[PDB]
Amino acid sequence: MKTVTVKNLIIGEGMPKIIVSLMGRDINSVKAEALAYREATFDILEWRVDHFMDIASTQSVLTAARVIRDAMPDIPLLFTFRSAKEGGEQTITTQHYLTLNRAAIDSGLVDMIDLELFTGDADVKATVDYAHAHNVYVVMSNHDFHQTPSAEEMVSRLRKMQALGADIPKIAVMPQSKHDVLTLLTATLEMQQHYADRPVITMSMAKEGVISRLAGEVFGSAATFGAVKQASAPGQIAVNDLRSVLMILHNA
Amino acid sequence: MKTVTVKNLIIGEGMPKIIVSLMGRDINSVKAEALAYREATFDILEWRVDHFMDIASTQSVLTAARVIRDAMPDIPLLFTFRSAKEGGEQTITTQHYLTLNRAAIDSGLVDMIDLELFTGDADVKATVDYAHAHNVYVVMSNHDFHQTPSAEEMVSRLRKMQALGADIPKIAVMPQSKHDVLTLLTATLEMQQHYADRPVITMSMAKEGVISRLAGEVFGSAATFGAVKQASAPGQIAVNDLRSVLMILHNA
Ligand SMILES: *[C@H]1C=C(C(=O)[O-])C[C@H](O)[C@H]1O
Ligand SMILES: *[C@H]1C=C(C(=O)[O-])C[C@H](O)[C@H]1O
Structure with a gap:
């Protein structure tokens, strides 16, 4: 398949990279969480923008993104507004969702963005090319918080994300x-063995x-x-525990 | 299901139990290895009899079991002669293998024995009843060191093991x-939810x-x-590592 590099990382080769989600409600919150995350060990930092209360202000969104980037300048920063329909904390319009991601891309403060696949083909396709035109990588995602679709359904979704130009398809x-x-x-192996040409999560x-x-x-x-301290979705375990298990499997 | 209690250990409840295999060629390495293992943390000791070079003598076999039994009197002791067609070090006749398992049971030194399913139905059943009349539990086993059979075949082997009175059906x-x-x-989970009425390995x-x-x-x-130092089959990992992973999954 293919690999993706952001900062000094290579995604899609070696041991799986560890992502942790930072969540704070307002600026002062973000700033405390950014200082405490600095002391943990992880590959990629995801900022969960949907927990932030000031999402109607571009000024506030970019000030929180800059406090994070300052604190951790050498870690790949993944900007994710997770909508309420896919498990997130808040509901915004589709327009407001796209304006927040564009702002993120033009700012220069973010290395990747997450775009939810079911946002709408034409909206996701136009944001993907806008991102790629600024050398921002796109994680395209899909979530089912109540059930597990068949393997067949899951591989099609993942293939749909590849057809739409995602750099990294993702399903939970x-x-x-x-x-x-x-x-x-099984859907993961099937995709990875027969269809993937990029990294998949x-x-x-x-x-x-x-x-x-x-x-x-x-x-x-x-x-x-x-x-790191709190989970951003049911099931995550502590990053030091997670990292021990990955190395055991990797050196076996 | 139902569980197996041996010594103070409940098999088939909680976190999986950990078995290590002790392998030694004669009585002084059996002894050395037994002293060394006495410093590790594990639930069930397996003595792999097929590595003992003096199996022609029953008395040398029972002296080696007593040496083990003496260094670790409080651990469940599983007596396993793995035959050469099922991955083991030496060939013995069917007759000698059923005689040896009967001598182990009679000796009072072992808590459990391993019986290979494909030894033959009638012989394996009679040996099961004899062990049970002595309160000796039976791990019935079946190995394919070249390939993986269908899920269906595997479920079928395990269910035939229960049908023969095995306390713990096992497949590798x-x-x-x-x-x-x-x-x-997939075979393990289908057995555990639909057919097992006892623990499986x-x-x-x-x-x-x-x-x-x-x-x-x-x-x-x-x-x-x-x-513990060396693997008794391809793929085993270090018992301290193995145990760290089981704990994290246990408390996940
Ligand atoms: C989707 C990944 C999630 C999880 O691991 O299940 C939560 C995360 O913050 C989302 O970006
Ligand atoms: C059967 C179990 C095998 C497994 O660990 O793969 C090895 C073992 O010693 C045999 O007892």
Whole structure:
């Protein structure tokens, strides 16, 4: 397949990269969280913009993004507004969603953005090219917080994200049973073996799906989420614990 | 299901139990290895009898068991002669193998024995009843060191083991691809939810199957093998490492 480099990282080769999500409600919050995250060990920092209360102000959004970037200038920064329909904290209009991501891209403060696939083909396609024209990489994502779609459905979604120009396709689903966890792992291998040409990230949420956060080096997920102090989705475990398990699997 | 209690250990409840195999050629290495292992942390000791070069003498076999039994009197002791067609070091006749397992049971030195399913139905059943009349538990086992059979075949072998009175049906298979590792996990979980009424032990060997050694609390395998200095089959990892991973999954 292919690899993606941001800063001094290569995504899609080696051990799965560790992503942690920073969440703060207002500026002073972001600023405290940015100082404490500096002392943890992770590959990529994701800022969960949907927990921020000042999202109608571009000024506030970029001031929070600059406090983060200052604190951690050499870590790849992933800007993610996670909409309420896919598990996030807040609902915005589609226009407001696209204006926040463009602002992020033009600012120069962010290395990647997340774009939700079901936002609408034409809107996602136009933002992907705008991003690529500024050398911002696109993580395209999809989430099912109530169920696990069949393997077939999941591979099509992932392929749909590749057709639309995502640099890194991503899917997260909620298991209703232990077999749902094996369906996610099978769709991941299937994509990675027959269709992928770039790095792919996949995960099964909650307690049953934790194995899916630990086995991406076997089944083909390029990155995984850990928690520094709080979890941004059901199932993440502490980043030091997460990192021990990855190295054990990697050096086995 | 139902569980197996041996010494103070409940097999088939909680976090998977850890088994290490002790391998020594004669009585003084058996003794040395037993002293060394006495410093590691594990639940069940497996003595692999097929590495002992003096199996022609029953008395030398029972002296080696007593030496082990003496250094570690409070751990469950599983007596396993692995035959050469199922991955082991030496060939013995069927007759001699059933005689040796009967001498182990009679000796009062072992808590459990391993019986290979494919020894033959009638012989294996009679040996099961005899062990049970002495309160000796039976791990019935089946190995494919060349490939992974279908999920269906595997479920069928495990169910036939229960049908023969095994206390703990066991299977180990060799993955030829990453899909094979998933087929092993799918068999384990289908057995655990639909047919098992007792604990089962399953593993996918080698470096590709390592994940199967760590995810037994999710997919339904009650025990897993680790290595104290050397591995007793392809893919086992260091018991302290193995145990760190089981803990994180346990408290995930
Ligand atoms: C989607 C990834 C999530 C998780 O691992 O399940 C939460 C994260 O913050 C989202 O970006
Ligand atoms: C059968 C279990 C094998 C496994 O660990 O892969 C090895 C072991 O010693 C045999 O007992």
